[PDB]
Amino acid sequence: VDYSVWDHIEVSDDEDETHPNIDTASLFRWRHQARVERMEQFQKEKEELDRGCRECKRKVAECQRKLKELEVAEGGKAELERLQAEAQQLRKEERSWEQKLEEMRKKEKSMPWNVDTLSKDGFSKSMVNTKPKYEKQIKHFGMLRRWDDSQKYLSDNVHLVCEETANYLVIWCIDLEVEEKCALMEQVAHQTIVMQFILELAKSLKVDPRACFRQFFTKIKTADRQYMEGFNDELEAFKERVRGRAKLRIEKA
Amino acid sequence: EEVETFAFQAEIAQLMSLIINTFYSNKEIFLRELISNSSDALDKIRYESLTDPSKLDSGKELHINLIPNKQDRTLTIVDTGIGMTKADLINNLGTIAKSGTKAFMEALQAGADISMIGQFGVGFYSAYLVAEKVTVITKHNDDEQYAWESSAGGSFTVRTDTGEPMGRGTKVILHLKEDQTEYLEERRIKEIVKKHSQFIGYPITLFVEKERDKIKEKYIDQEELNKTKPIWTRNPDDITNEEYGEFYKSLTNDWEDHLAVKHFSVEGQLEFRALLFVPRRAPFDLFENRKKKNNIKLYVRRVFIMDNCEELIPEYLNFIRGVVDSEDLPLNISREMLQQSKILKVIRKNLVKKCLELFTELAEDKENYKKFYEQFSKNIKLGIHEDSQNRKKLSELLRYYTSASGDEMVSLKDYCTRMKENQKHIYYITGETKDQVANSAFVERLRKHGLEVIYMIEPIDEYCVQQLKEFEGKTLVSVTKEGLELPEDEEEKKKQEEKKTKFENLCKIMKDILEKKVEKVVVSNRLVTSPCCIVTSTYGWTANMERIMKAQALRDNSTMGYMAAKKHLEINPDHSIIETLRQKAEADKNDKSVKDLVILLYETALLSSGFSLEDPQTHANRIYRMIKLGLGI
Amino acid sequence: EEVETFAFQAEIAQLMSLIINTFYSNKEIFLRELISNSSDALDKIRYESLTDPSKLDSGKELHINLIPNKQDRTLTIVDTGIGMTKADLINNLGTIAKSGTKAFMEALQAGADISMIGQFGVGFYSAYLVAEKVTVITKHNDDEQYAWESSAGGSFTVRTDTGEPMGRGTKVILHLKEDQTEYLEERRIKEIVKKHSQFIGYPITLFVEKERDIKEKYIDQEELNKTKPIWTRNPDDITNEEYGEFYKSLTNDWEDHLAVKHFSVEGQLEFRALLFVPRRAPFDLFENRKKKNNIKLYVRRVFIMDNCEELIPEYLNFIRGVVDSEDLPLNISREMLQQSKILKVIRKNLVKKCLELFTELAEDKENYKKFYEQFSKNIKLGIHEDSQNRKKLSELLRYYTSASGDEMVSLKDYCTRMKENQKHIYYITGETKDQVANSAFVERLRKHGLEVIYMIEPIDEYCVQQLKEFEGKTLVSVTKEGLELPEDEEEKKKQEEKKTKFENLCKIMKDILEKKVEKVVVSNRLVTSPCCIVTSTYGWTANMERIMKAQALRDNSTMGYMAAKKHLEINPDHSIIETLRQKAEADKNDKSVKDLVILLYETALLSSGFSLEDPQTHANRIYRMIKLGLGI
Amino acid sequence: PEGLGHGRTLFLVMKNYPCTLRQYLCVNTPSPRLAAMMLLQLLEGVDHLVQQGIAHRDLKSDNILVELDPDGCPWLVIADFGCYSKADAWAVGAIAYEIFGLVNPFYGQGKAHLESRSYQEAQLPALPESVPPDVRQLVRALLQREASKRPSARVAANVLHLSLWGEHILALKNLKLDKMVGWLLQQSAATLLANRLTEKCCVETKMKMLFLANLECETLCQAALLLCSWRAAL
Numbered sequence A: 001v002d003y004s005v006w007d008h009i010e011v012s013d014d015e016d017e018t019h020p021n022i023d024t025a026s027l028f029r030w031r032h033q034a035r036v037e038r039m040e041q042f043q044k045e046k047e048e049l050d051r052g053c054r055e056c057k058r059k060v061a062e063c064q065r066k067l068k069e070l071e072v073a074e075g076g077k078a079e080l081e082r083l084q085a086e087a088q089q090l091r092k093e094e095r096s097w098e099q100k101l102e103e104m105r106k107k108e109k110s111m112p113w114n115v116d117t118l119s120k121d122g123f124s125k126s127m128v129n130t131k132p133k134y135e136k137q138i139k140h141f142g143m144l145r146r147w148d149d150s151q152k153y154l155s156d157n158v159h160l161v162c163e164e165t166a167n168y169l170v171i172w173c174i175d176l177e178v179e180e181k182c183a184l185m186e187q188v189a190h191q192t193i194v195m196q197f198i199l200e201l202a203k204s205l206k207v208d209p210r211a212c213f214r215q216f217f218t219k220i221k222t223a224d225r226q227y228m229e230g231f232n233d234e235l236e237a238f239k240e241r242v243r244g245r246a247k248l249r250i251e252k253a
Numbered sequence B: 001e002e003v004e005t006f007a008f009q010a011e012i013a014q015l016m017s018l019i020i021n022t023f024y025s026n027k028e029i030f031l032r033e034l035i036s037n038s039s040d041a042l043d044k045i046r047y048e049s050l051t052d053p054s055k056l057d058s059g060k061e062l063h064i065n066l067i068p069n070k071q072d073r074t075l076t077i078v079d080t081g082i083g084m085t086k087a088d089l090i091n092n093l094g095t096i097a098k099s100g101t102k103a104f105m106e107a108l109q110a111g112a113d114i115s116m117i118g119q120f121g122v123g124f125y126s127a128y129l130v131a132e133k134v135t136v137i138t139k140h141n142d143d144e145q146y147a148w149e150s151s152a153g154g155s156f157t158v159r160t161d162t163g164e165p166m167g168r169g170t171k172v173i174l175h176l177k178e179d180q181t182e183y184l185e186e187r188r189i190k191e192i193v194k195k196h197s198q199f200i201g202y203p204i205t206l207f208v209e210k211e212r213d214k215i216k217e218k219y220i221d222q223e224e225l226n227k228t229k230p231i232w233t234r235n236p237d238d239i240t241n242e243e244y245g246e247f248y249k250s251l252t253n254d255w256e257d258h259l260a261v262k263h264f265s266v267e268g269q270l271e272f273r274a275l276l277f278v279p280r281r282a283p284f285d286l287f288e289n290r291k292k293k294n295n296i297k298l299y300v301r302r303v304f305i306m307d308n309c310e311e312l313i314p315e316y317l318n319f320i321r322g323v324v325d326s327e328d329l330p331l332n333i334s335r336e337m338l339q340q341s342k343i344l345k346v347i348r349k350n351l352v353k354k355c356l357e358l359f360t361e362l363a364e365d366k367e368n369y370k371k372f373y374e375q376f377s378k379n380i381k382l383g384i385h386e387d388s389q390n391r392k393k394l395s396e397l398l399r400y401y402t403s404a405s406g407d408e409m410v411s412l413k414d415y416c417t418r419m420k421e422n423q424k425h426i427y428y429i430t431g432e433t434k435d436q437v438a439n440s441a442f443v444e445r446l447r448k449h450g451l452e453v454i455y456m457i458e459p460i461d462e463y464c465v466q467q468l469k470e471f472e473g474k475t476l477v478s479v480t481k482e483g484l485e486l487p488e489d490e491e492e493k494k495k496q497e498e499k500k501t502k503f504e505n506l507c508k509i510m511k512d513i514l515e516k517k518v519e520k521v522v523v524s525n526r527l528v529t530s531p532c533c534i535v536t537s538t539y540g541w542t543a544n545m546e547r548i549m550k551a552q553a554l555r556d557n558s559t560m561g562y563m564a565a566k567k568h569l570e571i572n573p574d575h576s577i578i579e580t581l582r583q584k585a586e587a588d589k590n591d592k593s594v595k596d597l598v599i600l601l602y603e604t605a606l607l608s609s610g611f612s613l614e615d616p617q618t619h620a621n622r623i624y625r626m627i628k629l630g631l632g633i
Numbered sequence C: 001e002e003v004e005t006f007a008f009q010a011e012i013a014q015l016m017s018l019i020i021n022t023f024y025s026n027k028e029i030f031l032r033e034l035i036s037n038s039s040d041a042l043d044k045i046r047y048e049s050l051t052d053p054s055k056l057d058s059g060k061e062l063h064i065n066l067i068p069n070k071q072d073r074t075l076t077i078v079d080t081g082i083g084m085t086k087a088d089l090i091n092n093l094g095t096i097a098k099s100g101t102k103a104f105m106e107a108l109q110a111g112a113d114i115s116m117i118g119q120f121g122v123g124f125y126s127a128y129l130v131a132e133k134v135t136v137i138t139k140h141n142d143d144e145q146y147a148w149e150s151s152a153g154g155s156f157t158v159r160t161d162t163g164e165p166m167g168r169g170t171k172v173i174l175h176l177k178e179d180q181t182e183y184l185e186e187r188r189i190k191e192i193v194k195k196h197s198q199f200i201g202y203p204i205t206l207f208v209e210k211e212r213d214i215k216e217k218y219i220d221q222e223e224l225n226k227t228k229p230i231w232t233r234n235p236d237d238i239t240n241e242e243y244g245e246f247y248k249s250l251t252n253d254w255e256d257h258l259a260v261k262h263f264s265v266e267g268q269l270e271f272r273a274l275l276f277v278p279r280r281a282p283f284d285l286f287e288n289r290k291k292k293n294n295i296k297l298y299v300r301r302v303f304i305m306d307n308c309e310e311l312i313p314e315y316l317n318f319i320r321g322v323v324d325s326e327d328l329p330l331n332i333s334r335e336m337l338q339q340s341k342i343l344k345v346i347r348k349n350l351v352k353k354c355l356e357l358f359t360e361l362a363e364d365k366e367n368y369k370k371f372y373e374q375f376s377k378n379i380k381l382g383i384h385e386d387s388q389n390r391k392k393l394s395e396l397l398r399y400y401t402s403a404s405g406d407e408m409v410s411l412k413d414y415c416t417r418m419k420e421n422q423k424h425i426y427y428i429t430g431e432t433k434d435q436v437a438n439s440a441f442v443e444r445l446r447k448h449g450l451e452v453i454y455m456i457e458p459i460d461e462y463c464v465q466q467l468k469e470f471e472g473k474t475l476v477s478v479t480k481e482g483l484e485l486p487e488d489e490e491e492k493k494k495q496e497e498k499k500t501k502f503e504n505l506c507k508i509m510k511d512i513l514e515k516k517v518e519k520v521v522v523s524n525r526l527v528t529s530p531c532c533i534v535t536s537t538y539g540w541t542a543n544m545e546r547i548m549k550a551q552a553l554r555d556n557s558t559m560g561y562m563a564a565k566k567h568l569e570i571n572p573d574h575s576i577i578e579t580l581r582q583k584a585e586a587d588k589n590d591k592s593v594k595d596l597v598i599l600l601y602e603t604a605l606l607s608s609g610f611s612l613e614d615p616q617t618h619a620n621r622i623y624r625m626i627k628l629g630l631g632i
Numbered sequence D: 001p002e003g004l005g006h007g008r009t010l011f012l013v014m015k016n017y018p019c020t021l022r023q024y025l026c027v028n029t030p031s032p033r034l035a036a037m038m039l040l041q042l043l044e045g046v047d048h049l050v051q052q053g054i055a056h057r058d059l060k061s062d063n064i065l066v067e068l069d070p071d072g073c074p075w076l077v078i079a080d081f082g083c084y085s086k087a088d089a090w091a092v093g094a095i096a097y098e099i100f101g102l103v104n105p106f107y108g109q110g111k112a113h114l115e116s117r118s119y120q121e122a123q124l125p126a127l128p129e130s131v132p133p134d135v136r137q138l139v140r141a142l143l144q145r146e147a148s149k150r151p152s153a154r155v156a157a158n159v160l161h162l163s164l165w166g167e168h169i170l171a172l173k174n175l176k177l178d179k180m181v182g183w184l185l186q187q188s189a190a191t192l193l194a195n196r197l198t199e200k201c202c203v204e205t206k207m208k209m210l211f212l213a214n215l216e217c218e219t220l221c222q223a224a225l226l227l228c229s230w231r232a233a234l
């Protein structure tokens, strides 16, 4: 395991560098400018050297070639001596190019990774959306009567948002109220009139009640003392209508 | 002399205590490691199957099951991965800091598809965070069932087991301490798997035992927790909008799909793909200093690493909900934070660039852009206030009401097109409400002359406009400042000069009487139907701007008290009122009425200009004086 | 059947890498570890000196030096603590996870005074984060000068050194990887020792080489660790003089603290603490999101972690202090606590003790005036946030009231002066003292002689909206609907009579001025102004609504929707409304009256702290009346 | 009917940036003390730039934006909105002649594209007497020809810290203030004076808080000996 490569990375836009007297924006555009300048400068140094070394080894070659030509010739190896001296110190200067060519590599080593060098974009694709029921767990959230239990219990599902769950609470409160036990009907109808409470209060937000579910239930940590305020009275008051609906319903079994 | 060389050795007993206690911050991660390791085993056996389907003969399916057992306080994770041979059990599990996975990968041919999770070879021992006695029963091909057992001591025992054949795979049985019994209930489990390791490739099927025995229900019930496949790994151009949407709903429980979706990837030393969604509606608690700052969750090789680090995306882009996933990052030993943070900074740069692109792309669907903008406009202005670089590219995303555009915002460019060949500036007025600025005193001259204006009616605006100095080489000027020079004819200029010659005295003595409030008073140029108005000094705070600051709750009180704003009063020379006023003045100086009238109209103008009077009581009393007179009390 | 027992073994190679690469998050910590270890060495020999003087015979200095040599890229930390004998060198430094310090501590008698920094045993190896080769040269009594030397590979070499004797002690030499030459310069070093380990007991003396060639500073000693840890000393033995010095040293400041708390808890959690309140608020408070706390946690005198939000609830930024414990479950990197709930217990104890410093400071009226006028915002903020201390926070408040001029008074001074029938506290929220002082609403009360409170700060509403009660006497704003103040029955029947006289006037005014007000009714709180506007009981108040709309980042929908419902009251004895009822009952639907009603309604809305939607209409009406009076 | 909305949003500070110094200077003139203060601001900024290694060769009064505090002292900010080392120093020397109302010499005199470009000797217009003697000596020493004698940014900023915030006493003079780290707290005590001595502008406190911290004795002692030598008239 080794992390050495990630050690040196350099980013123009850094929050830490800012000083109260220097404007952030111009500082960033200065730093970025300096980085771009330095990287292109090192690259230009590298390319200019890449030429120099190549053309000096080329000189090594031409010296060889024409010295070989004179090597074959008669009596001209005095020119061999002189140009062999030229070529030997030329070869050392070529090894100097090599030396700084290796330094080029060392600079590349020290070249701190920046946003461009580190990564090159591969692919990209954007899309724009252009587009325009569990009754027994309703009975369970109902049985609870502590709308924390029922809150996360119906936050179990996306279906709670659908009008259909609200429509079913109507069904279940109605037919429960004539199940020969009045208690459980209001032990859920607290949820029903809380449904309508948050319905018109999220309409006082004009937001879909579905959104305001979590907004209301855990509104504040105290949550209006589990919302002790106004839930019973209003629910027995809605239980009036639920009783009418239920009683007519039981007549139809 | 003599140099003696010795090799490093380790005190196993203390070393293991170190590993158990000091490494992992949170105790619940242990479930992640066992799961991850089991996933590695699955990948090994699956790879082996491809070359030789003979290997998968022992067992077809590849699943991971968690079987909590409350009665005996044992939580067992069963996987059907390659198991461990006897030698492997002793070597891999037995030696600290050795990871079989790393070996399998290195041996494997280069470029192999399989990418396995763990490499450190120390993660497994974390199970002792919540267990005293761990028991591993494994059975692998070419070997018999064997059962490693250890109690976190220096010793581990390997015995050939003779129990029910488990087939290919590993069963790891934990025995929970008296404390940390919390892990047994399915609630905590389900939660944890949802938090970390939700997107591992294989089906995690919990086996909880519920007894009804009344139609008995849920004797044992497999609730496959890991449900949604990771999408971002799939290639684009294969993902319809609907599929992307399902992921959004799952990622963030929401009843309605996303609004727009970006999806891209970068290859390089930093390799990382990404999903970015913009929600259809803003959340209720955005900008409520809620604990959550960013919603994007970082992933590595698919295990949730870390979230909500501020560095990921700047604050103005907080709404973007997304999943970033890479294949290799310098990771802290606990696997809960990057080693060095500058990698996160490169990530941030790439993100904001792509996101801003997603936006300017959305500008096409005028309808969708209307929805998105009226929803998250604040964030864009905030960015203008903060992001230094993207400021320019941010600007175009703006949209405003203007004098011309009616009940339809327009960009800044559309206004740049409709410039009158001499505008040289953009005219904007900041206020509280559209109608009010619309009927304001300042704009009247322009609307007469036909120059267009912009209604910036939001508190957040000033924060933006104060830095949005220029745009497309055409600058911005507020109408409520001292100069307001608009293109005119020379005859108009000499006429205005004549006005000044006529009214120079009137300004003088009004300055005299109405002292200690206004620096100076001068014949106006921007008024055509109202007697007078107040503009602030060029450099000083505009009236509206001041109003905003005095209101901010956590303002520095002392500075606000020290603060004062210079006022300059302009008078409209052709108005009948000021005309008769110059008459009464040049007629007689120091008349009582002209004094009181002047105070009255200055007060009412200060009221109309948006500035608020220091004490309304004097003004109200002056009004009452007048009413009484009319009523002939 | 047969059970084969083996023993855990470790891949030393991989383990070593894990430690150097993955374990420690910030590279600069290596300086902390080497220093801490040397401190331990120092503590050992001091202890040993106690029993026998002979042990300290070699040298008595007990000091630490750090000589950076740029010339050869070697940073060497030299100490005079008990060194290590060969055996120890091989065993301690060699074997991973073996802590000689731990062994020494265990061996000591239970009541031993010494407290030694580390026990984990993996620390020394951190040096490799910045060093290719770590050469340790140590000489300890009972052995000859040796020289450990390792290159983070699988091996280490130990050899008797024959160089200059360094007496007793230990000297660790580093060779820095070229890429990390930054640590060599005096600046980075000095910065580091201050941030981590500036409170270790012994003297840290840097040796930087400078040439003034005239020539000087060839080798200058700059003792970095200078301020001594105070909190360890006994409280009550420290005068308010030194407390200040430590403060200025702790937080660079040109003046001294304002007040200082100092205490210690010895339970399951043993921790001491210093808490200071600065004289002047930091100019950037509440403006920088990054810095939330100023207290710095310490464990056994080394800086662990700071600025963790959990330590103190955010409305205590101004508090500047230091927390130090002797033992905490610490992450291996020694940069964060393993259990975070410990921080919670710490927070509770802290806030309790701080709220004490403050209610204690309430005595020095003068000092309390200074402190309160400085950091009042924070207290109200706490009232807004802290649920429990809300009650105990309240008393720290101070306000202007009708009866007190230029002298803020607590809520209690007002509870005492409550006339027998008050049953409530009367407060009015506004924007400036004078304005609320001359307001329309208060006039009745000031006539009846009651006292009222001027809440003139934007932050107030956030507080008062939750400060429902106080000492069983509630609060009521004067700008609400039902301001019911104690009265006589004759006054009541007279008011009833007023209503009988004016019932029609309210009706037709409601008619003409429709849909701007919900109801108009004969007033009870006015005595010299014709009319005023109070908001509905449940809705928002006037300036509360104003402040909210003026907030920079606010949900537009919610802000508009939760709003005031306006009710206009009329003062029945005023001459204006009297003549108005005359003109009305005389003739209905007269042009004049219509406009009059809307003119005075506008001016009242203006004087009620509300802002008219469009001033232009009002200004034009004013101009019309001006032209009329001036006969234009 | 009784729903809640008391959240607390994030607080944002607003900064007017109305003008560039050239402007603010022609419209208003500052008192000598406040002028020294803003000169200090510039020195600090230029140093910080020198540290990051980015050197804006060109600094002109049009570049420096002025942040008008509301009814409050101007806060200077360097910027490049208008398109080696020690050059910035020479530039800031010339900005100064302006702050005191003396129009820039070299904007018209010559040799401004390079401080190395030799201006005519001593033609520098003598500063008005409203400036304290030490600041005067400072700008003269700063605008001197050679970068060799030219003191670096940090030296100058320390000189100003000494003179303005620090005590003005004889120990302070004539190099009686023997450098010490303990003397750094003595410098704070020296800075205790001037906290309320001229409290007409709030910036004094601000700068005191934001810069007094990073004060380094070596540069401080160099600044001290230079400060004495002038005043000493040695």
Ligand SMILES: Nc1ncnc2c1ncn2[C@@H]1O[C@H](COP(=O)(O)OP(=O)(O)O)[C@@H](O)[C@H]1O
Residues within 6 Å of the ligand: B037, B038, B041, B079, B081, B082, B083, B084, B092, B093, B098, B099, B100, B101, B102, B117, B118, B119, B120, B121, B122, B123, B124, B125, B169, B170
């Ligand atoms: N369920 C399993 N099935 C097969 N092999 C396993 C299982 N769990 C662990 N191992 C083996 O035991 C080794 C212990 O490695 P571990 O401590 O988990 O670190 P890592 O997370 O790097 O794998 C693993 O490398 C793997 O080879």
Ligand SMILES: Nc1ncnc2c1ncn2[C@@H]1O[C@H](COP(=O)(O)OP(=O)(O)O)[C@@H](O)[C@H]1O
Residues within 6 Å of the ligand: C037, C038, C041, C079, C081, C082, C083, C084, C092, C093, C098, C099, C100, C101, C102, C118, C119, C120, C121, C122, C123, C124, C125, C169, C170
């Ligand atoms: N400078 C020193 N002088 C003497 N003994 C030392 C020195 N540094 C380390 N040691 C010994 O070598 C052991 C190495 O321990 P280390 O890795 O530092 O872990 P710890 O921080 O727990 O001591 C220490 O326990 C200590 O006994």
